[PDB]
């Protein structure tokens, strides 16, 4: 009954702004507090903020005051965040989450997350080059944004293969490589992002 | 205003008892929660009030404490129960939140040292003007691997990355790739490339190396 869904998240540059929006229903909107969470990556959760079940109180989390402003608008049933002078730091997950019915010092449901991400890298397909009981690969490199897919032999081999998470270097570009334990090997390879899908013949 | 839970992560086989402690640096006001968070994946509420089970948390799941110490306890670990949880604490006033950085509940498994492979920078990648040397890990339990990079006897600090996969779906073991990333002038510079790791199933370093 109760539902929490998310949007606004992006892929933006420094400076810049976003706005996030959380539309509730299954439940009494204007009764409960709402919050921010957010969950950069590779991190445990971090709360952001938090805006009176009446809109009229508001609190931030240090590290964006004064940047971001958390808003709610009753008649809509819609919890917001504007995002404003962005950074690269603020690039994380970010769920929207209800004060507990039964104990408001507990979040009882939570949106399914909006991404943000921060950078002032521009969106380019990656290069695919070749990793050369046998093991060859793929290295998928630099690429932006996530994500990239990785398949085996379009998908007819599976057994051994391990695709690992992507790595965000310090170009600000992601990298990541998907291998096989072991014919013919080709990684499929596709940048949704780039419009960029490569097939590479591993020799 | 610190929530700090212990242990970090948690190895169990199916079946066994799961207890997670979280402690607060002053006594809480009101009882704290707990949430399960799987990878990619919102939290979710798991028991409020130090010992209320919330909505279809089933009955495995149970909670306690007061003042400053609280504990999780998962009687009998199902397979869906491995993942991460995190404690949680919030007043009335100021009204902020605070979260345990969070246990991982691990599925243990004998142990298995993992399979090591060196890969060179490809020709191709070397005309980019780039030279990426990887080094595989593969299929190993436990966790814990230590993976030692160095070119030409020299060791190489700061200037590679290392990616983990999940638990594999089938054999849980783990599987890891670190990269090393050098300018294709300084790979150009040096002969002896080598990846020594380090880990429970090999009675001593495993290192594989090339000479370019
Ligand atoms: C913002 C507001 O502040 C207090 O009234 C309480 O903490 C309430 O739960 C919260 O939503």
């Known amino acids: 009954l109760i539902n929490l869904v998310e949007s606004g998240g992006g892929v933006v540059q420094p400076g810049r702004s976003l706005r996030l929006s959380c539309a509730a229903s299954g439940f009494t909107f204007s009764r409960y507090g709402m919050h921010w969470v957010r969950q950069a990556p590779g991190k445990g959760l971090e709360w952001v903020a938090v805006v009176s079940s009446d809109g009229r109180t508001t609190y931030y989390a240090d590290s964006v005051k004064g940047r971001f402003t958390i808003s709610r608008d009753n008649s809509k049933n819609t919890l917001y965040l504007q995002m404003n002078s962005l950074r690269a730091e603020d690039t994380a997950v970010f769920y929207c989450?209800?004060?507990?019915?039964?104990?408001?010092?507990?979040?009882?449901?939570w949106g399914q997350g909006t991404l943000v991400t921060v950078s002032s890298a521009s969106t380019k397909g990656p290069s695919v080059f070749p990793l050369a009981t046998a093991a060859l690969g793929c290295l998928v490199k630099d690429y932006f944004p996530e994500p990239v897919t990785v398949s085996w032999n379009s998908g007819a081999l599976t057994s051994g293969v391990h695709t690992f998470p992507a790595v965000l270097q310090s170009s600000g570009l992601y990298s990541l490589s998907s291998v096989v334990t072991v014919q013919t090997y080709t990684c499929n390879v596709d940048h949704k992002p780039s419009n960029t899908k490569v097939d590479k013949t591993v020799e | 205003g610190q929530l700090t839970q212990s242990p970090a992560t948690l190895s169990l086989s199916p079946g066994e008892r799961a207890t997670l402690s979280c402690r607060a640096s002053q006594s809480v006001t009101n009882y704290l929660a707990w949430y399960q968070q799987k990878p990619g994946q919102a939290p979710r509420l798991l028991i409020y009030?130090?010992?209320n089970r919330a909505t279809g948390i089933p009955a495995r799941f149970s909670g306690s404490g007061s003042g400053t110490d609280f504990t999780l306890t998962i009687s009998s670990l199902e397979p869906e129960d491995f993942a991460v949880y995190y404690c949680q604490q919030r007043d009335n006033w100021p009204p902020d939140a605070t979260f345990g950085q969070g246990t991982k509940v691990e599925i243990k498994r004998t142990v298995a040292a993992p399979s090591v492979f060196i890969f060179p920078p490809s020709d191709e990648q070397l005309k980019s003007g780039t030279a990426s040397v990887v080094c595989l890990l593969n299929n190993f339990y436990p966790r814990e691997a230590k993976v030692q990079w160095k070119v030409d006897n020299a060791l190489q600090s700061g200037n590679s990355q290392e990616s983990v996969t999940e638990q594999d779906s089938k054999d849980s073991t783990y599987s890891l790739s670190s990269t090393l990333t050098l300018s294709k002038a300084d790979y150009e510079k040096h002969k002896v490339y080598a990846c020594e790791v380090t880990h429970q199933g090999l009675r001593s370093p495993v290192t594989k190396s090339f000479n370019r």
């Open positions: 009030g130090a010992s």
């Open positions: 989450a209800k004060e507990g019915g039964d104990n408001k010092f507990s979040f009882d449901y």
